[PDB]
Amino acid sequence: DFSQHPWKAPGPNDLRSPCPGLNTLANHGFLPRNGRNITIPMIVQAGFDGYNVQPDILILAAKVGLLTSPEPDTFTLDDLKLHGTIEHDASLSREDFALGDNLHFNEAIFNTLANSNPGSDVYNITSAGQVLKDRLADSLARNPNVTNTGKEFTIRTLESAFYLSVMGNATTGEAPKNFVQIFFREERLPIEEGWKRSTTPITSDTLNPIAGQISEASNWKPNPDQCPWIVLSP
Amino acid sequence: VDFSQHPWKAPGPNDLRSPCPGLNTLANHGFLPRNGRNITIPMIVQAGFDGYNVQPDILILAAKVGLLTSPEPDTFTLDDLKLHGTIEHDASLSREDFALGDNLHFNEAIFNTLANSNPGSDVYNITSAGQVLKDRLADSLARNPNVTNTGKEFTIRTLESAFYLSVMGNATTGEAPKNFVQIFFREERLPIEEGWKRSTTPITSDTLNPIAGQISEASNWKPNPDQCPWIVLSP
Ligand code: HEM
Ligand code: HEM
Ligand SMILES: [Mg+2]
Ligand SMILES: [Mg+2]
């Protein structure tokens, strides 16, 4: 029932993340609107309620997210900005940590995703891959501190599988462009615009094939002498 | 803390245990569930404080990484913690390498090195701890073609050695009566009847790290050249 879950703009003391997925859930009150005191069970519930995303992938992501917080079993959405845990260079809608603000939505960065799949009414696996190339190529040219290993790349293919899957079709990875634009720009569920919570459950068995196809369409190579790492503590 | 309400009891076949004498001992006295199940990060902080006077910072971090070994949302079992390459590492003090046998259970043959350390002394110390780290790594290098030896394992090994010296011994000097350390590993018991008292000084990152750092210097250690440190993220 989305009627109990109206969108509201985050106010002054309301903490947000670099993740449109969680920010959208907070802005609809599926997570605390203040973005504080989030447990792994609250993530599993908000993800299932909002998007029909199943626990498997949410538990893993939330456990890694926890490492960004000094708290025993909670994090704030602001904690999740910690560079090198999940937050990575070559984001779709955020600047690289080394160049500026790795937290907030940035229209200038988002422009690439916005303008992708020209002449189509959807983003798809092909356009998602092209955006991954363009964003990485940007960070490699302007960021001498770029981190581009297997870890960041896997997360990038998964995050791109996420926007295609939760705003669009979880099997084909096609998503109406206006749904994806609203998701990123307003961190809002485009309910009035016709968006429905996925009827098909979003699992690692649906996300992985989509992430894999985005990967193939990205024509990716790692930086040669970089070791994959999860920063373990703030 | 009242240890009278926390009696040692031999773990049964019902009861899940880890490769960690620290947690296993806490479970054996009922500071953690004796069945070794349904352990939250808050239960770890409390059991660590109650049993050993260990402060939350280092326990929170260790427990959050331990969680990665579990498919459950916010709990692990002690048996989950055996997952090779999360925390569990080659060149353990009392367990065999995953590649060569059992990386879970106490092994007397492996423990022999630590047991015979600091010969002609009644205590184990930073010097003997360092020598045991060299000897155990050298053993794994000789016998384990698949040995993983990077900054991550080494840091964890210096910390785990700082832990046995600190919780069974003196948290400032890193000296520990040998029979305390030997019961801790062999029986996963607080040696209360044998005179062990919970540390009066709080065991923190600021007490552990200096000890781990000195153990490191006494270990004369080098990483394997072409290995990347990594935390295995899921079973
Ligand atoms: C619930 C479904 C989820 C969806 C649909 C989702 C979606 C996304 C998307 C599309 C991005 C890419 C943003 C960009 O590159 O500009 C992203 C980034 C991120 N997400 Fe999620 N997410 C979800 C769950 C989670 C969870 C559970 C966590 C952590 C607990 C998380 C943490 C992050 C972080 C830290 C980033 C920053 C990565 C970066 O761009 O550098 N997300 N998410
Ligand atoms: C609370 C005080 C703690 C103490 C005194 C302690 C002590 C130790 C010691 C001495 C070892 C080395 C055993 C050996 O090499 O044979 C060890 C190993 C281990 N501990 Fe802990 N520990 C503590 C807390 C924790 C916590 C909170 C976790 C995870 C939640 C944990 C997980 C492990 C694991 C997985 C190993 C296996 C490492 C290996 O030898 O391969 N311990 N612990
Ligand atoms: Mg980023
Ligand atoms: Mg081991």
Numbering used by the authors:
A (entry chain A): 6 to 239
B (entry chain C): 5 to 239
Question: What's written in the study?
Answer:
Unspecific peroxygenases (UPOs) are a class of heme‐thiolate oxygenases from fungi that have similar catalytic scope to P450s, but are dependent only upon hydrogen peroxide (H2O2) as the external oxidant. A recent survey by Faiza and co‐workers explored the diversity of UPOs within sequence databases and was able to identify two major groups of enzymes: ‘long’ UPOs (Group I), typified by AaeUPO, of approximately 45 kDa molecular weight, and ‘short’ UPOs (Group II), typified by the enzyme from Marasmius rotula (MroUPO), which are of approximately 29 kDa. In this study, we have cloned the gene encoding an ‘artificial’ short UPO (artUPO) close in sequence to MroUPO, and expressed it in both Pichia pastoris and E. coli. In addition to their overall similarities in fold, artUPO, MroUPO and HspUPO feature both a glutamic acid and histidine residue (E164 and H93 in artUPO) that forms the catalytic acid‐base pair, in common with CPO and in contrast to the Glu‐Arg dyad found in AaeUPO.
The structure of the artUPO expressed in E. coli was also determined to see if there were any significant differences that may result from a lack of in vivo glycosylation. artUPObact crystals were obtained in the P212121 space group and again featured two molecules in the asymmetric unit, forming a dimer that was again connected by a disulfide bridge between residues C232. The monomers superimposed with an rmsd of 0.26 A over 232 C alpha atoms, reflective of their very high structural similarity. Few obvious differences could be discerned between the structures of artUPOyeast and artUPObact, except that the N‐terminal residues D6, F7 and S8 could be modelled in the latter, but not the former, and there was of course no glycosylation on asparagine sites N42, N129, N150 and N174 in the bacterially expressed enzyme. Despite this difference in peroxidase activity, the catalytic efficiency of peroxygenase activity toward NBD of artUPOyeast and artUPObact was more or less equivalent. The enzyme was challenged with para‐methylthioanisole 23 under similar reaction conditions to those used for artUPOyeast, giving a 65 % conversion to sulfoxide after 2 h.
